[model samples]
Target: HMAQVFEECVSFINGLPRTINLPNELKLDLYKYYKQSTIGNCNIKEPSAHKYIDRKKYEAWKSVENLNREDAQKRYVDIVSEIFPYWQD
Candidate 1:
């Protein structure tokens, strides 16, 4: 169920038309979960100190970094649902 559910959400999100506007907050949250879902943790390399904003993004990455692939995928599904609860074809 994990792989099936996760891939659907990823495709659905990327496939969504531009007309469908979602809050930036949730989008950022979703991005982190998505990253964590495919790639393991975010501690691979030290994020540069000069780029604080980059650090923050990496910070957000690690925030969901604890979740393994399966857990992260599940989160992505729910997070996708959070933004597109009214999704209809």
Candidate 2:
């Protein structure tokens, strides 16, 4: 049941235009889950530039380092559902 929805969410994100506007919180959620789902845990070292976007991304992903892939997938789907209620595979 939910496994398909998770796949759909991945597809939806993949199909989304790069220029599409997304809220900062939503973007952070995506970054966190994308990293967790794809990379397992955060292993990359934080950059020296404190204010860099990459640093922010690293921190956001690191926050969810303990989240498992399946849970991350479900979370990704849930966020998409809230942001785009009309979204369907």
Candidate 3:
């Protein structure tokens, strides 16, 4: 659901601000994961619908022509958890 997507994004993204600051590498990773899991799932009607500040950077890192969507999604999931230490709900 879109609500869940929004909630997750808010919680996950906001969850960091109160802790240590996030790096661009982390931001890029976050944006990528969110775009795939949330944005891809949402059936958004338009492009540029879901994005963080460094959209272009994240997009550049995601090469559909090579890595493929499934591989990118898998790697995004794996890499993102590295950004948060002791990150648990």
User: How high a TM-score does candidate 1 get?
Assistant: 0.78
Minimum summed lDDT over a 10-residue window in model 1 is located at: 80-89
CA shift of 51, model 3, Å: 13
lDDT of 3 by residue, 1-89 (tens): 34443454346656656767667766666565556544453232333626554446445445332544455455554454465433435
Cα deviation of 19, candidate 2, in Å = 4.7
Query: Candidates' TM-scores?
Result: 0.78, 0.82, 0.44
Q: Find the candidate with the highest TM-score and give its number.
A: 2
Per-residue lDDT tens digits for candidate 1, residues 1-89, read 79877887788888888798887677778878888988879856768978986776777788886788999888878776776775423
For each candidate in the order shown, give its overall lDDT on alpha carbons: 0.79, 0.83, 0.50
Model 2, residue 10: what's the lDDT? 80
Score residue 45 of candidate 1 by CA lDDT: 75
Clashing pairs in 3: none
